[PDB]
Structures are given as C-alpha cells and as structure tokens.
Symmetry: C2
Subunit: 227 residues, 2 copies
C-alpha cells in the first residue's frame, strides 16, 4: 500500500537529476524509494560522487512510479537490451512512467515515446523526434501517465508536479515550503532564449561532441524500433 | 590537477542530502575543481532520507581547502556540540578563501564562533536561532559578508552555488553552468516561502517544527555559552 517509487541509477548518471527528485519525493508520507541497478552497491556519477543502488532489477518490487534520470551514461543505456527490457517491464503496469533531462532519450530508445508529447534537455531536444515523440518545449510535459522534465534542475519542478498527482496540492505545497523552494537565481541564463548570445555559443560548443555521438546512437536505436 | 581549487563539504549522519548534492553538481561543473566529502573517517554516511553517501576523506587527511561548505539537516544539532568537528571547521576557516553553508549549516558555523557580528541567513523556520550565536539575521536567500556566504533553506543551495561560482571564476562561467543546468525554474505552486504559501500551510509547518525548534534552542544557548567562556 505504500507508494513504490523507483529511480534507475546507472554509471555516469548526472546525480542532481536523481537526488533533487529523491529528496522531494522521499519527504512524502507512505512512500518507499528504490535506487535500481543491475546489482546493489556503489554506482559512480559523472562528477565522481558515489551513490548506492539499493536493489537489483530482480528484487525491485512492482513500481507505482519509475523515473529515469539523465547524464553522460544515457548513451550506453540506449543500446543496453537488459536495461530497456527492465524499463518496459516496469512501465507496463506503473501508474506513472517518468524521466528527467536526457532520461527521456532512454524512454525513447525503449519505444515508450512513440506518438507522445515529451521534452528533454534543451541541447538535445532535436533527438526526440527520431525516437517518435512529439517534441514540446516546456519544462514539464504530461501525456497521459507519462511525465517528462527538461534539463537537469527541472527535476525539482517535475517532482513537485508529480507529488501533487500522487497526493494533492496541499501536500505538494507543504513539501515546497519545507524545501524553501522559492528560487532566486543570480543570473537569467537558464534557457537559451534568455541567456547572452556568447553564453549560448559556449554551451553549444561544449555539447557538440556529445550531441554528435548521441545523434548516431539515436538513429541506431530508432532503426531497431522500426525493424 | 594539482593546481585545482579544493572544495570541501562536511558530510555527517542525518544530513539533508540536497543541501550537499545540489551545490556539488554545480561546483563540480567548474574547471579544475576537486571536491572532498569530509567526515571523521572515509566511508558510508546515511542522509536523513536514507540515501547513502560516501565520505572521501577524514578530518586529519583533508588538504587545506579553498572553500569549506557546511550543509544542514536533522544531524546539525549533534554537530553544534561536537568539539572535533568544530575544531576542524575553525582550522579550515582560518585560511579558506570562502567559508560557506546552506540551510541549517549556518547554525554549525555559529556554534564554531564564525558568525559573530556577521550577516547570515538559514532556513526560514530556524532563522530566530541566528541572533544568539552573534549573527546579524538577514531574510535573503543568499547572504554575503566578506568571505562568508550563507544560503537559506534546502533548495537555496543551487542559488548559493551559482553565486559562489561567479566569485571563484566570473559571471560568464557561472552563466554557462546555469545554462548547462537549464536552471530557469518554474515551480508548479507558489508555496516556497512563508510569505507566499497559504496560511494553513505555514501553520501546519510551524506545528510540525515546534519540537525541533525548542530542542535546537537549548542546544543553541549551550553553544553560545561556550563561546562566551
């Protein structure tokens, strides 16, 4: 009867995609949160922060919510048949199938975005269409029981949105107040629409090699879905 | 590299993990930074939610830090009366470029004597405990006083870390990281501050926190007496 929430915790995850939502959702009543990988034990994030998976695929209970974070490690998962099969298995009955940032590319590689409205990190948004999604430039996108959040820190907005759906608005507001989540960013550079042009150029320049490698992975993953 | 900026977070039992992991992912995005997670010994440390983190160094082996950062959480009350942790904080603060905290981590800085006559903030529900530790309490989300930088409650860590990034590097670098993080927040509700949340929500929360507040007040006044002697 406790709500069972599971995050996929994989090597080279972007940890904040996971730890932001985790601290929001673990604050709710009658929940249990699992960190899932092929085996329990240490998993190292892209920054070198060490996290700890609490369950293997086999011992994971049926999930009410599955959540896929993003990160450098997404590329490997998009061509990992075990991970994709596990995600499909849990998505079949999950009340909600969800992701943050480039985690939606993993959902796409699993076939779960076909015909659905979805978002991802702004720098990788062009990769949603080949995976079958209708790409939407909004920070949290809901299509039926699929909820996708945009890049990294969107996980906090996503998790508060999810909290209200699992419980109600008042419960989500209580958690928002406990987290003192009234952001006041010191700059206005969080979106390519508002950041200075020089900043956008540098961020795009840094992401270019990753984007090219992910363009190639995405087209192989899409071709497998088609065949 | 061996010229890296050395950033250290105190990692303690019953920490509020987001106070640490939010800033960590921001600051680890900067060029040539090394981040340490510091406790009495290396090894696993369990956060208040059950998330397991891993300390990378002991107090004794930690190198001189450029930045020390104290997160908050249920575990702060113990730290405020831990002579070994307070001695480490004071030692590192003697030479750090920036002495910093998030959320109730500032009460630990206060217990260490580092807020006397200094402007500071903390989580909104515990803000009254700043003044007995000698601080000038400021109701702002990120507060600077010289090389001291304190963030307000939990999620303020992200705003704090981008502010610190601009001081360590420059505004252009902090903006790039903000864009890489897609940090253009759009909260689904407006209940992040006691001034904007529904009154019924603020009341419920004060009702919940009252016991912790009375317990932390007594610890706070004991810690203040130790500074006075």
């Amino acid at each position: 009867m406790a709500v069972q929430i599971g995050f996929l915790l994989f090597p080279e995850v972007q940890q904040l995609d996971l730890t932001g939502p985790h601290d929001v959702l673990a604050s709710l009543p009658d929940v249990q949160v699992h960190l899932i990988w092929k085996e329990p034990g240490p998993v190292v994030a892209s920054s070198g922060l060490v996290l700890q998976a609490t369950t293997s695929f086999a011992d994971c209970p049926p999930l009410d919510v599955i959540c896929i974070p993003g990160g450098t490690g997404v590329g490997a998962l998009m061509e990992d048949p075990q991970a994709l099969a596990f995600i499909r298995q849990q998505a079949a009955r999950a009340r909600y199938v969800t992701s943050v940032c480039t985690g939606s590319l993993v959902l796409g590689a699993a076939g779960l975005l076909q015909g659905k409205r979805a978002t991802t990190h702004w720098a990788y948004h062009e990769l949603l269409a080949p995976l079958g999604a209708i790409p939407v430039h909004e920070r949290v996108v809901r299509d039926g029981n699929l909820l996708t959040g945009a890049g990294i820190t969107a996980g906090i907005d996503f998790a508060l949105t999810l909290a209200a759906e699992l419980f109600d608005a008042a419960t989500a507001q209580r958690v928002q107040l406990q987290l003192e989540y009234a952001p006041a960013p010191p700059f206005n550079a969080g979106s390519p629409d508002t950041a200075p042009a020089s900043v956008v150029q540098q961020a795009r320049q840094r992401a270019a090699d990753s984007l090219h490698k992910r363009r190639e992975i995405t087209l192989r993953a899409a071709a497998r879905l088609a065949a």
